[model samples]
Target: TPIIFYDIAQRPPVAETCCAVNPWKSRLALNFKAVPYTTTWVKLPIIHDPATDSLIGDSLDIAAYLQRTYPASGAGDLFPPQKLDYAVGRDMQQLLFPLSSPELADYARFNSNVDAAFTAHVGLMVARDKMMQSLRNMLGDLAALFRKDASGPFLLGQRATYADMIVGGWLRMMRATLPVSEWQEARACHGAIFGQLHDALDKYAEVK
Candidate 1:
């Protein structure tokens, strides 16, 4: 039997693309692990099994559940408290915390495909300086973590894992939400590695 991978409905003019970071993380795990599932985009996200009538939403939860359930799938491991062994589960959550700030949340909203009126509404109040400074600082620390591994573009160095997906989740959103000038600059500010990770993660970012 297959699992149902729920995701946010793609905005019009790009029905095949999913731009939300939270769901994108889980989607990346699903695609990366090559699990048997079908996607069902909605107004939100979930991982459900019709047989059990069960559902999980949070990206980390969904990722862990998939990894545990499909531990022998041979596609890959999401890691942590498992064979691969790493403890960034909480760290991953913390990494994205900055985006939840009032200004950045609204920042994400304004950049998304929404009513132009609403976008304009936020334009009057967005904090580019705050976001720019904070994100710059965060990525610098994140880059340090990756560099500590001493090899490869991934957090653990060599292979992609759920930990990578957690941060990459927003990196994709950061790229998708921000216009080229801003996204590219931000991507570059952190170092070539973030951009490297993003590019290597191409297939997993597919809407399917």
Candidate 2:
């Protein structure tokens, strides 16, 4: 059966950072594993696949389900057995998401049905600058991490794993939400790393 990816509706087509990142994680897992699938777009609070009468309610669960059901032959495991590195990637998403939440909120204005709580959380005038600065600081941290290693482009050198997908999806959402100039400014602090991550993500960009 073809996998059906359920994702949130975009005003144009196209994030708690989970709403966006989760479906993205699922998509990347499918793409990386070369699984054939189609997508079904819906509003928040649902991720159902009619093929199995399965409703994966969150991103990580969907990833686990895909990995369990569609193990890759040679592309490398998305959730490796050691898992420390994978956990680090997950931690990075948690750290970086709040930084991008406001931008995501602004981006949601483009959605036909915006979440009221999201608007209220990020809607304050004072909160905007604070969040942007938070984003910049987190970007700087990523730059430092990337700077520490130049052996390869990805967080996990020489390969794009689930860690890369988690963070890359977050970056993708931020880029979509903010203006080019603004997003560029944040990334310029770590341009080399940013470019590398973008390059890694490009391998699966068409899937999103």
What's the lDDT for residue 95 in model 2? 32
List, residue by residue over 1-208, the lDDT tens digit for candidate 1: 6888876665633323665767877788888888777887665468886755769876666766776677766457766421222222232343333331232232232222112212222222223766565556555655765776757888667777776776677677666556567667766876677788888788787666
RMSD of each: 9.0, 9.2
Candidate 2 residues lying further than 4 Å off, grouped into runs, are 12-19, 44-54, 81-130
Pairs of residues at least 3 apart in sequence or in different chains that clash in candidate 1:
none
Model 2, range 1-208, lDDT digits (tens) per residue?
6656666654532212233544665566667777666766665223455556777765555655666666664376666532221112332333333332232232222121112212222322212667666556555654554555567776547766665665666566556566566557655655657756766777776543
lDDT of 1 at 163: 65
lDDT for model 2: 0.52
